[PDB]
Tab-separated table of N, CA and C in Angstrom:
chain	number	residue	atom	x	y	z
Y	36	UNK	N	0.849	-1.214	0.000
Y	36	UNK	CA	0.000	0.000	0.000
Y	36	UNK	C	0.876	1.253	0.000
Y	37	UNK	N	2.115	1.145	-0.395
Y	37	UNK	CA	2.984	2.055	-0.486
Y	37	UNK	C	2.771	2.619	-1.950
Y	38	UNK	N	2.365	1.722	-2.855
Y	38	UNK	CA	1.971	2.394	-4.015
Y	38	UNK	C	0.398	3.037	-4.009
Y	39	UNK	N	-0.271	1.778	-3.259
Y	39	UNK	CA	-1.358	2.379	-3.492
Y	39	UNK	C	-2.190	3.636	-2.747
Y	40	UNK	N	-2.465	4.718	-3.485
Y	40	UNK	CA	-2.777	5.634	-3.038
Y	40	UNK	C	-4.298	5.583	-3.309
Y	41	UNK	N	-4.939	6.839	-2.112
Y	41	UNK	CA	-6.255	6.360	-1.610
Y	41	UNK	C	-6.779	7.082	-3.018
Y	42	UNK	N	-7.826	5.689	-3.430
Y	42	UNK	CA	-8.573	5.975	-5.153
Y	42	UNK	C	-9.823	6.574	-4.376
Y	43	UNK	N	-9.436	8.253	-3.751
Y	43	UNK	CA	-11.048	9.060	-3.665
Y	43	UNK	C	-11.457	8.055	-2.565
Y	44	UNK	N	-11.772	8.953	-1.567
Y	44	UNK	CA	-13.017	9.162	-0.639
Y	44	UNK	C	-13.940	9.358	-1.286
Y	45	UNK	N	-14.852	8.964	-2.157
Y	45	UNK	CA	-15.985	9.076	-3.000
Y	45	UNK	C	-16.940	9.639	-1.877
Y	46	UNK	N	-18.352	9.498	-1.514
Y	46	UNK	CA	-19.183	10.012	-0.777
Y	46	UNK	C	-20.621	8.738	-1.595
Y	47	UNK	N	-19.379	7.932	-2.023
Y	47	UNK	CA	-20.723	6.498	-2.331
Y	47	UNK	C	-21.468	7.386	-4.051
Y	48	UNK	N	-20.685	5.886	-4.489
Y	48	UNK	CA	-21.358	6.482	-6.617
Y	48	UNK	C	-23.352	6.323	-6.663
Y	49	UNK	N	-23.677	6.375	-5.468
Y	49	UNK	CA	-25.193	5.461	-5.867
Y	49	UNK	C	-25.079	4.272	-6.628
Y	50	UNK	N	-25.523	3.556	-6.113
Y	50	UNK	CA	-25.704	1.664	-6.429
Y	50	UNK	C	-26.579	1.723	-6.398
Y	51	UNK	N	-27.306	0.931	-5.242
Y	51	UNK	CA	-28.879	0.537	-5.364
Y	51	UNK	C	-28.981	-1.045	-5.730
Y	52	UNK	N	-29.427	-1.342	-5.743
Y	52	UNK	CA	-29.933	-3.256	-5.985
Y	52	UNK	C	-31.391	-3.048	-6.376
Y	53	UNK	N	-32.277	-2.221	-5.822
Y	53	UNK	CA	-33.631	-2.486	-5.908
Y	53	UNK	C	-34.261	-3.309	-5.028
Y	54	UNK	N	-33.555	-2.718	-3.622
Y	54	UNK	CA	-33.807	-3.702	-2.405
Y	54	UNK	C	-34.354	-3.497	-1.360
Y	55	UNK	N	-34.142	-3.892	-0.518
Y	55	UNK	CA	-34.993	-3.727	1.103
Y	55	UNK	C	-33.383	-3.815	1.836
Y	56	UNK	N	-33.217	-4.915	2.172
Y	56	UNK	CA	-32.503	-5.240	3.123
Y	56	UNK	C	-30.785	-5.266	2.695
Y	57	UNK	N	-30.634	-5.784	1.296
Y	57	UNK	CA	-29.430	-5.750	0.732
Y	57	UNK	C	-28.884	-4.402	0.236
Y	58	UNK	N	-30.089	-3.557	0.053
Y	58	UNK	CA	-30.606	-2.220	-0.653
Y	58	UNK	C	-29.490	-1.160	0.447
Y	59	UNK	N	-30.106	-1.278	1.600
Y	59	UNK	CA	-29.939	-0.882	2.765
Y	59	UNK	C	-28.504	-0.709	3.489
Y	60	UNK	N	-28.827	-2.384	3.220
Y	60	UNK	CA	-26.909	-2.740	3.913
Y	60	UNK	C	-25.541	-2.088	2.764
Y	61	UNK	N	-25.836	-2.150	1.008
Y	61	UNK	CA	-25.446	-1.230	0.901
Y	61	UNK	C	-25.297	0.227	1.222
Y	62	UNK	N	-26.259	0.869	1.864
Y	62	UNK	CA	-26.902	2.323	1.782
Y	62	UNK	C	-25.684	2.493	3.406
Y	63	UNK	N	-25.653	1.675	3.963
Y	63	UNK	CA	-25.207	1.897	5.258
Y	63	UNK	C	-23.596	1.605	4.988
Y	64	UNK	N	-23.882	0.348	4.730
Y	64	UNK	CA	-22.188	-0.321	4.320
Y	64	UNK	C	-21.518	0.763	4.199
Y	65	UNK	N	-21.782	1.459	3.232
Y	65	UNK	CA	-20.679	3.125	2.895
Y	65	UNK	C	-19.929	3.549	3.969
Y	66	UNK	N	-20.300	3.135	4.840
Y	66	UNK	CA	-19.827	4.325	6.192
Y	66	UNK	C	-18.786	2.813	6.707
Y	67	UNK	N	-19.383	1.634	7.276
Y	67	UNK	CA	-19.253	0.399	8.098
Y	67	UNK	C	-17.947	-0.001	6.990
Y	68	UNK	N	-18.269	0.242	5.473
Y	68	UNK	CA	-17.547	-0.523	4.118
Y	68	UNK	C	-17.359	0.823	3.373
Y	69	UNK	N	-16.149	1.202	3.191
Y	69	UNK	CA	-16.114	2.507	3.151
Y	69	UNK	C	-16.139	2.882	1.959
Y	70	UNK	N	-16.240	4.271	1.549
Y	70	UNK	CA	-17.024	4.619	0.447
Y	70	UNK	C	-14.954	5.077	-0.232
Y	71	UNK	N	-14.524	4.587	-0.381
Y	71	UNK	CA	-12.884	5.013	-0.608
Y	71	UNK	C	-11.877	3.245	-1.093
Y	72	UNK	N	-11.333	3.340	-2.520
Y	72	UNK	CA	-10.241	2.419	-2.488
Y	72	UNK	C	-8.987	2.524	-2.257
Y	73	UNK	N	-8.176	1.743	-2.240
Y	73	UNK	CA	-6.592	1.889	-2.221
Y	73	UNK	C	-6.109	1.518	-3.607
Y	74	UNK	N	-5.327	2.205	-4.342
Y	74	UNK	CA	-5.021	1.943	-5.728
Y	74	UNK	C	-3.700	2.593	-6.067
Y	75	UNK	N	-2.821	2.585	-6.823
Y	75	UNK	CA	-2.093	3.596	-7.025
Y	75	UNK	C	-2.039	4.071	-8.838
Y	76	UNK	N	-1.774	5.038	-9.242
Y	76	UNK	CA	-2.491	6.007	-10.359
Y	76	UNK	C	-2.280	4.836	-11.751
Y	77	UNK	N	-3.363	4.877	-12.108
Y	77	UNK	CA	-3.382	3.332	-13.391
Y	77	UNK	C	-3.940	4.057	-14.597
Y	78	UNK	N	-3.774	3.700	-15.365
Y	78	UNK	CA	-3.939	4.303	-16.922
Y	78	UNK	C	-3.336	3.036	-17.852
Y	79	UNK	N	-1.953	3.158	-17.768
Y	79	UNK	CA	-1.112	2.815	-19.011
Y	79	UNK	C	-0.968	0.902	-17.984
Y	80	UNK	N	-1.798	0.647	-16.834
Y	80	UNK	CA	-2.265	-1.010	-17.226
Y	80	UNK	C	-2.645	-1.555	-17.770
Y	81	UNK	N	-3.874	-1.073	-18.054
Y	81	UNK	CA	-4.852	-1.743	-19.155
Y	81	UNK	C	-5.891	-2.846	-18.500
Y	82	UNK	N	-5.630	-3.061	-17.176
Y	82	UNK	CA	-6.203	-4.227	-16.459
Y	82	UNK	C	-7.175	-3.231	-15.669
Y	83	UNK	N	-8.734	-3.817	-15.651
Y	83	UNK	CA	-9.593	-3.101	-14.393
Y	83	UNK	C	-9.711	-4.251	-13.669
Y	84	UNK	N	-10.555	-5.268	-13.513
Y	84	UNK	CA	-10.585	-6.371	-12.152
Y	84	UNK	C	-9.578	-6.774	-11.786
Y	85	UNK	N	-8.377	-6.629	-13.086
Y	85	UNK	CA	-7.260	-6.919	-12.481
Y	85	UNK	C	-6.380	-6.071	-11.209
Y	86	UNK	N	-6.689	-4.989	-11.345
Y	86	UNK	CA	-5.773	-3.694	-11.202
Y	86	UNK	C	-7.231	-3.312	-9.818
Y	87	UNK	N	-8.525	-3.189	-10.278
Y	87	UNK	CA	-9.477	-2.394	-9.604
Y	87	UNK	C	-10.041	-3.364	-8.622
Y	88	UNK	N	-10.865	-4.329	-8.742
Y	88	UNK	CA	-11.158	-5.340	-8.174
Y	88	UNK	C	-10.110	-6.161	-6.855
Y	89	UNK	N	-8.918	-5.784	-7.268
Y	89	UNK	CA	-7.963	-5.985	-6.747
Y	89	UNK	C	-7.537	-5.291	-5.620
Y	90	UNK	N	-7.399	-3.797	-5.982
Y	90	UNK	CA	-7.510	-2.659	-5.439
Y	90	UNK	C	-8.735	-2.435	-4.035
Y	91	UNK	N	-9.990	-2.917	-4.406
Y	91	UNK	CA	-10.955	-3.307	-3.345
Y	91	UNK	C	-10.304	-4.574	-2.324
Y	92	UNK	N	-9.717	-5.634	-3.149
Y	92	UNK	CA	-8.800	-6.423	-2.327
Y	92	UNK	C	-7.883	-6.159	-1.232
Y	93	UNK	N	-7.851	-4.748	-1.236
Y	93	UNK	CA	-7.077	-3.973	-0.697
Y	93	UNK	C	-7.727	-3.144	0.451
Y	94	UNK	N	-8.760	-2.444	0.067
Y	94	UNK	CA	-9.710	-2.060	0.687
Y	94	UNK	C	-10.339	-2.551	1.356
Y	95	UNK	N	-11.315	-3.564	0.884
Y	95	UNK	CA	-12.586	-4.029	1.566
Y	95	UNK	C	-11.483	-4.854	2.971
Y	96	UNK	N	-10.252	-4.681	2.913
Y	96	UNK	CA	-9.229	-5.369	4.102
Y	96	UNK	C	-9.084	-3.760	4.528
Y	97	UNK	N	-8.448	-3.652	4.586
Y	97	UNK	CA	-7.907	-1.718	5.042
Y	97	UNK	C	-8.585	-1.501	6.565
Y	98	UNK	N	-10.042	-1.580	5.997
Y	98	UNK	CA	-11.484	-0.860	6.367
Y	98	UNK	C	-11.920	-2.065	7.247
Y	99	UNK	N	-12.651	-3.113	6.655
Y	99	UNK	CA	-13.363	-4.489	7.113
Y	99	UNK	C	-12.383	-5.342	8.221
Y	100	UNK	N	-11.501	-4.936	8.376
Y	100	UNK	CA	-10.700	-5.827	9.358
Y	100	UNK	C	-10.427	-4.906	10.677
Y	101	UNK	N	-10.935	-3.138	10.217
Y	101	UNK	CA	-10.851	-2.990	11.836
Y	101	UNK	C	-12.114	-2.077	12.102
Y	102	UNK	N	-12.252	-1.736	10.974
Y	102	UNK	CA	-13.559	-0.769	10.260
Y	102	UNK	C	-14.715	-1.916	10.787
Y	103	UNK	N	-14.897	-3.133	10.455
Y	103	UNK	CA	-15.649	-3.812	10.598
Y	103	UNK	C	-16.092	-4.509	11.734
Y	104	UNK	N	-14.769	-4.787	12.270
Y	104	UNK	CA	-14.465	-5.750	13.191
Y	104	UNK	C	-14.798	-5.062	14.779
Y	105	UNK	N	-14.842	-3.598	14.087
Y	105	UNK	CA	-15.206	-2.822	15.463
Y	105	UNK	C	-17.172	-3.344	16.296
Y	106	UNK	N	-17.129	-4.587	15.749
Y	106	UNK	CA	-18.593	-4.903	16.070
Y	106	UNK	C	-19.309	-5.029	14.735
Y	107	UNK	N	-19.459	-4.972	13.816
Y	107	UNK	CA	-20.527	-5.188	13.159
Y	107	UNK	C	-20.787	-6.423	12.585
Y	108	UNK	N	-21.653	-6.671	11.669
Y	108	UNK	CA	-22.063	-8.031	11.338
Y	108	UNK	C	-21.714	-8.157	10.110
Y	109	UNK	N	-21.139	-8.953	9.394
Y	109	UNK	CA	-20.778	-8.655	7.726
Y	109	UNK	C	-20.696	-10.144	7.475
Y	110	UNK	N	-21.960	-10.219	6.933
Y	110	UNK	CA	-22.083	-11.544	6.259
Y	110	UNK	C	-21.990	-11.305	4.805
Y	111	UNK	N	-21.951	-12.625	3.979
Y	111	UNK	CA	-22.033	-13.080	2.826
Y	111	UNK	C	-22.287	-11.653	1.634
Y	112	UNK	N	-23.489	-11.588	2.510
Y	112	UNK	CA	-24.073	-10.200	1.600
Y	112	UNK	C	-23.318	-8.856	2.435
Y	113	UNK	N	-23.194	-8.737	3.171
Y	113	UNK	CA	-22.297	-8.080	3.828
Y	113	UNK	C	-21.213	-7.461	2.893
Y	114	UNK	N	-20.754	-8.161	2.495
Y	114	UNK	CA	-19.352	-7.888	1.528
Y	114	UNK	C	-19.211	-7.522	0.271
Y	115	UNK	N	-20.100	-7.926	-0.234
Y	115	UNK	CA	-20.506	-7.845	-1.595
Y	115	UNK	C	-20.864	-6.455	-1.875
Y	116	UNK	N	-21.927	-5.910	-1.248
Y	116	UNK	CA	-22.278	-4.474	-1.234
Y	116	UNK	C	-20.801	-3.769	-1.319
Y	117	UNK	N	-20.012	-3.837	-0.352
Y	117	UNK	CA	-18.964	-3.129	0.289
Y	117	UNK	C	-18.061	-3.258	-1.280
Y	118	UNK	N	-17.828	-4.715	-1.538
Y	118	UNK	CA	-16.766	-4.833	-2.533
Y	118	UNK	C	-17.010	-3.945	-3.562
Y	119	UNK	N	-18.210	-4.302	-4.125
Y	119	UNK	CA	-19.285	-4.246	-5.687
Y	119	UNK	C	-19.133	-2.425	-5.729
Y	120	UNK	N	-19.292	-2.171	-4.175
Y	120	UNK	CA	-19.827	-0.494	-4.581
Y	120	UNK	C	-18.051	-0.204	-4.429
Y	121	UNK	N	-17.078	-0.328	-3.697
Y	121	UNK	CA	-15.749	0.110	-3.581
Y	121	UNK	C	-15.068	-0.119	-4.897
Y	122	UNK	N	-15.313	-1.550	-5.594
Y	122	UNK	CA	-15.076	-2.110	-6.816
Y	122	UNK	C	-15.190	-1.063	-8.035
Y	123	UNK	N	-16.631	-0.944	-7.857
Y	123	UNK	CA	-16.850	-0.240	-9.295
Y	123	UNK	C	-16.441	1.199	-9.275
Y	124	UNK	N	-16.720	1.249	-8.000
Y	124	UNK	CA	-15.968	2.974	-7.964
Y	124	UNK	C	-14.128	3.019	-8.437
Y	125	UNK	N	-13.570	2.062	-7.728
Y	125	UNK	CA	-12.593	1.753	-7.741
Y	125	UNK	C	-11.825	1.553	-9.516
Y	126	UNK	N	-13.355	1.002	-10.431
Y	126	UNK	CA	-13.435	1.349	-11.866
Y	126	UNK	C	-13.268	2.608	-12.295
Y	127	UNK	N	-14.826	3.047	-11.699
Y	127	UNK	CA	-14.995	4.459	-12.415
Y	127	UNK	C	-13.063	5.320	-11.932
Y	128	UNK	N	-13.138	5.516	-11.091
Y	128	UNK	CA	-11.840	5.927	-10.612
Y	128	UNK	C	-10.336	5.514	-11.119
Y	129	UNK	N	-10.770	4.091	-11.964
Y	129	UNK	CA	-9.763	3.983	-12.827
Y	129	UNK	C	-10.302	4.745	-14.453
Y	130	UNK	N	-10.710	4.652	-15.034
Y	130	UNK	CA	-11.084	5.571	-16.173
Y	130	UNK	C	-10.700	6.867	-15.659
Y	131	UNK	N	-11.225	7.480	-14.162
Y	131	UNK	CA	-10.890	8.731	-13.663
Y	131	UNK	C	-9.505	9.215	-13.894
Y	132	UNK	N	-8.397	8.211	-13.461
Y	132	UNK	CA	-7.207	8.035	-13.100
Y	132	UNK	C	-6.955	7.856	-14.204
Y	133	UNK	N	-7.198	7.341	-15.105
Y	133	UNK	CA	-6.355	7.528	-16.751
Y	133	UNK	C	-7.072	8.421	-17.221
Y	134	UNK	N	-8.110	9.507	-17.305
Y	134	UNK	CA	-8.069	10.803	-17.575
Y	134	UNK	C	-7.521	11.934	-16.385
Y	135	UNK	N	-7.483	11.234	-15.320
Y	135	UNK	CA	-6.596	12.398	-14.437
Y	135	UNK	C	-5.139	12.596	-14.694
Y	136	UNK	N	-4.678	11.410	-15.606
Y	136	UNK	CA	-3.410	11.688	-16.853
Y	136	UNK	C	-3.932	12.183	-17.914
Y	137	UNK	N	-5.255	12.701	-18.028
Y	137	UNK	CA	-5.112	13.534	-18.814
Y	137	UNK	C	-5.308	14.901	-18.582
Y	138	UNK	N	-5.536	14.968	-16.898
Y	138	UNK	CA	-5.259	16.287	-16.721
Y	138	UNK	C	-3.807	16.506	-16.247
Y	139	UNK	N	-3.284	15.743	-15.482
Y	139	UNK	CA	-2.135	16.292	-14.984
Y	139	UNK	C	-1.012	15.861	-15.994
Y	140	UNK	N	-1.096	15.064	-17.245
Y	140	UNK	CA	-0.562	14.848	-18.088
Y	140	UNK	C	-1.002	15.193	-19.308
């Protein structure tokens, strides 16, 4: 994590499931599963699950191992929310990150 630098404190991309309870545990997760990845600046990889998904690999640990562990319950579905929404942000934030070479480059 020496490379990887924090991919945005986002404030949560809106997800949604179309849910009640999974709906929710995302809606909350954000805070419990944090709305922020660990990544360091990607463009010229070419890999996203490789590189991004991965990057949540990074995260959904960071956060969920003390972030989590501070008491909460994180089951099955638990994680998924956390990953899926850190994940894709962790996407969008890579497209971000290879046009943020195109701003700062």
């Amino acid at each position: 994590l020496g490379g990887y630098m924090l991919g945005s404190a986002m404030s949560r991309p809106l997800i949604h499931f179309g849910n009640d309870y999974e709906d929710r545990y995302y809606r909350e997760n954000m805070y419990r599963y944090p709305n922020q990845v660990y990544y360091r600046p990607v463009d010229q990889y070419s890999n996203q699950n490789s590189f991004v998904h991965d990057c949540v690999n990074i995260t959904v640990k960071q956060h969920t191992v003390t972030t989590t562990t501070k008491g909460e319950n994180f089951t099955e579905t638990d994680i998924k929310i956390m990953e899926r929404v850190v994940e894709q942000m962790c996407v969008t934030q890579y497209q971000q990150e290879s046009q943020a070479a195109y701003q700062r480059a």
